[PDB]
Design an enzyme around this catalytic site. Sequence first.
Site, short mmCIF file in Angstrom:
data_model
loop_
_atom_site.label_atom_id
_atom_site.label_comp_id
_atom_site.label_asym_id
_atom_site.label_seq_id
_atom_site.Cartn_x
_atom_site.Cartn_y
_atom_site.Cartn_z
N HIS A 120 0.83 -1.19 0.00
CA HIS A 120 0.00 0.00 0.00
C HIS A 120 0.86 1.24 0.00
O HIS A 120 0.29 2.31 -0.20
CB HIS A 120 -0.93 0.02 1.21
CG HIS A 120 -0.36 0.29 2.60
ND1 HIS A 120 -0.06 -0.60 3.56
CD2 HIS A 120 -0.09 1.54 3.11
CE1 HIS A 120 0.37 0.04 4.61
NE2 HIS A 120 0.35 1.32 4.33
N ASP A 136 -0.30 -7.46 1.15
CA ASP A 136 0.20 -6.11 1.30
C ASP A 136 1.72 -6.22 1.23
O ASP A 136 2.41 -6.23 2.24
CB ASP A 136 -0.27 -5.54 2.66
CG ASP A 136 -0.04 -4.03 2.78
OD1 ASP A 136 0.44 -3.40 1.84
OD2 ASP A 136 -0.35 -3.47 3.82
N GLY A 161 2.91 5.91 9.29
CA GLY A 161 4.27 6.19 8.84
C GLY A 161 5.17 4.97 9.04
O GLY A 161 6.22 4.81 8.42
N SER A 178 4.35 1.83 8.34
CA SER A 178 4.07 0.87 7.26
C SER A 178 5.30 0.58 6.48
O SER A 178 6.07 1.48 6.17
CB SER A 178 3.14 1.38 6.22
OG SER A 178 1.92 1.62 6.87
N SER A 229 1.95 -3.64 8.12
CA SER A 229 0.85 -3.36 7.25
C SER A 229 -0.10 -2.34 7.84
O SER A 229 -0.35 -1.32 7.19
CB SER A 229 0.06 -4.65 6.96
OG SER A 229 -1.07 -4.38 6.12
#
Lengths: 4, 198
Positions: B36, B63, B141, B143, B159
């Site tokens: 993502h 993801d 942030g 991720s 994720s």
Amino acid sequence: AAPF
Amino acid sequence: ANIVGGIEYSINNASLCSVGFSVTRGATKGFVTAGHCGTVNATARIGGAVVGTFAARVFPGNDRAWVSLTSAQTLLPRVANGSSFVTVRGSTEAAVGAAVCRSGRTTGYQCGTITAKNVTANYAEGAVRGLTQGNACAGRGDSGGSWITSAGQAQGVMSGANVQSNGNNCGIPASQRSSLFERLQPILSQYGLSLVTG
């Protein structure tokens, strides 16, 4: 839950 | 730029995410991160300079993504823990109950335990299945960032989580946190990547  | 798990990078001069792990694909350098965070061919920058582009990703469903870097980048077998580092030793998947930490540009290095596997996250874009849940906290942030045990076994990439109005889930007890990561092993075999270790 949310992305990240 | 030195590529270290947990550090910030921007995508197309707009979103921020965190580096998951240095990997190679043959002679190509790259790092794994969350799907993502960017679309294929999105430009990744670290500290204002272009370091590479998104080579592949799958989001939602899964993801995951990897960014292929230019030759100029220095891949390192390490994950940021404050001013120190955790060495990446391999990718043995830890079991539920195992302690694990995660590293990212918003909350830094946080530890907790794995509480469940094969969780579905229902994001606005669609469901992402197969995630492992830990109760280490995290914030917007983080991720893409590394999840790794203290022994240096790489677990996966950040994720999502049950964020509160402050942008993270660090102000609620561990018992109430659901911080989810994408397992590393399916990403490595899906793209034929080898983890950089030390």
